[PDB]
Design a protein around this ligand. Structure first.
Ligand SMILES: COc1ccc(CNC(=O)Nc2ncc([N+](=O)[O-])s2)cc1
Ligand SMILES: COc1ccc(CNC(=O)Nc2ncc([N+](=O)[O-])s2)cc1
Lengths: 345, 344
């Protein structure tokens, strides 16, 4: 069909634009900040995603600037970017790697089939999500919108890639940040309470909500309003001590409810390690939550470090131990756990 | 079948306990706060709703205290209230016996939406008008509902009567006193709440009502979004970017990267309906119409017509028996609100 040719700038390396042609354009999803398309590169035949957002000439696009700096196996790669044109309006086009599925779509499949995602996949997906967070957090960048829809999945290789950096921002201690980011169901308590001094740990809470959801087969803290969502949290974590509330946001009345034993939250067959990890991610006190790197090192992921592990389709697991110094910067000693004896010999 | 008899306190008037018996109990809908049941009064066979919530031993229920003060045709009435148990040896439960209403705007609107149809404008007028009366009334006492949404608007299919319910988030707003900004359900939250304001006023209810009006006219929520950011984008598309001063009026803070109003609704949408929406959904809280002013809007002129009738041929509900209390915010408006024929 129609062949579109543009002069695009490579995502990484020096700003040296090159002519790029693509075709077979289709809509993948319509988001508030723009539309995402699927296209095929005439050159290689590779499929790519093109995120198109309205861009005003007076100020640089933050998502673009953040993506040009990222380079990690568990984060969607920015291949190129370019501008296009009703008319007086200019659009920034982000050419990203295209990934077939999302955790949202896959989980929905199981949910509908009255089944739950096999735990091996929960381990694979969550471990990789934590690696992506360890990486961006090492640069002080907080995603701020971790949710199933932003977790891309390749069904064949079991590779997970974090996407949509439209809400991402470098968090600088002392500088206020809007509390209205992050999607409902996945918002950390401090955000619901209106904190503007939150840290990257809000990504860890969101991650914990995703893990819980994959184990449960449905969101763990649903609610149409903040109040409702907080009630669901309280029912599991128990009523927050005024100390913990202080930890979240430096004035409401909540029902005094005693913590619900995490073991009774999930079905009987739920692995003990999964429940334990959840409880260490979903904590009221932000600073008490595990860091992404610490989560990766958790016992729940031990099976991934077993030399004989294989994917259900018979293929070998994706790369899981190619850690860089940057990625391990928050706690280098964890390398002795994260990189097993058999890895990268 | 099973008959339950309890001794309850009247919702209003002297505290003369009354023996109440009901049967055929069934869940109407659960909810973070408390479960709501449907039950039938033994003698009269009349149906009622029973809202059961855990009784907090330290303080008295705020919903109860507020409900005991209300008496209005467009607000569900608290007939009685009593205590008991229901789940586990200790915890006490507060039971609010309320008037039962057949439908909700949520349920009715969904039926039309599924059939790709929209509620006839005459009903939109009647429902929204009664909603605004209920707000004028509670606001006259300084009480803000804080959770106006289709699910909390009860409807009687036959009489076209609308009643506001669920005062679980309602609160007396006092100038100078902070209030949590995490109340109100997604889609219906005023911009100032999204921005985290804690000094908001009863006008957040007007914004929510505006969202319901727009939704009934459109066939779907007007400002959808899974995050506050997304919601703000939808709002910006319609209202345009907020001036830095408008931002100041909303929340005494970052950035944002095109639908007028006459391009939002279907072709034959009444002009007055669009005008009303634009005056309810304003960034500057103080710029929004008050509930009483909304009732007086031209969109509701047809309701003041002497010959107006419901589609089923019945007369409309009583729409002009305003009390001094209801008009207190602006007595002079009664010259518009009360039609000539109503003064005969
Ligand atoms: C039928 O259209 C589709 C096709 C694929 C999907 C799920 N697959 C995807 O969303 N893949 C994506 N890759 C990269 C993205 N990005 O924005 O950076 S989105 C959903 C709908
Ligand atoms: C099938 O059970 C039902 C029956 C009716 C409905 C809709 N009708 C209602 O909810 N009516 C209500 N009346 C009073 C209420 N209150 O809380 O004060 S809720 C929903 C479910």
């Amino acid at each position: 069909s129609k062949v579109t040719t543009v002069v695009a700038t490579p995502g990484q390396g020096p700003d040296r634009p090159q002519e790029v042609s693509y075709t077979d354009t289709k809509v993948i999803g319509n988001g508030s900040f723009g539309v995402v398309y699927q296209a095929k590169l005439c050159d290689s035949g590779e499929l790519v995603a093109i995120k198109k957002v309205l861009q005003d000439k007076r100020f640089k696009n933050r998502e673009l600037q953040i993506m040009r700096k990222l380079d990690h196996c568990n984060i969607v790669r920015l291949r190129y970017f370019f501008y296009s044109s009703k008319k007086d309006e200019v659009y920034l086009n982000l050419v990203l790697d295209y990934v077939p599925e999302t955790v949202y779509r896959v989980a929905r499949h199981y949910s509908r089939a009255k089944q739950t995602l096999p735990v091996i996949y929960v381990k694979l997906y969550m471990y990789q999500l934590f690696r992506s967070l360890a990486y961006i957090h090492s640069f002080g960048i907080c995603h701020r919108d971790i949710k199933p829809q932003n977790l891309l999945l390749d069904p064949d290789t079991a590779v997970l890639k974090l996407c949509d950096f439209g809400s991402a921002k470098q968090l600088v201690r002392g500088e206020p940040n809007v509390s209205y980011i992050c999607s409902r169901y996945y918002r950390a308590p401090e955000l619901i309470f209106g904190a503007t001094d939150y840290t990257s740990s809000i990504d860890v809470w969101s991650a914990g909500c995703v893990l819980a959801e994959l184990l449960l087969g449905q969101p763990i803290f649903p609610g149409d309003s903040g109040v409702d969502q907080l009630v669901e949290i309280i029912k599991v974590l128990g009523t927050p001590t005024r100390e913990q509330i202080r930890e979240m946001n430096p004035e409401f009345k909540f029902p005094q409810i005693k913590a619900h034993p995490w073991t009774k939250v999930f079905r009987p067959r739920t692995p003990p390690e999964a429940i334990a990890l959840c409880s260490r991610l979903l904590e009221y006190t932000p600073t008490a939550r595990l860091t992404p790197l610490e989560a990766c090192a958790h016992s729940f992921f031990d099976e991934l470090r077993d030399p004989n592990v294989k994917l259900p389709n018979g293929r070998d697991t994706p790369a899981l131990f190619n850690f860089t110094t940057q990625e391990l910067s928050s706690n280098p000693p964890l390398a002795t756990i994260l990189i097993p004896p058999h890895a990268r010999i």
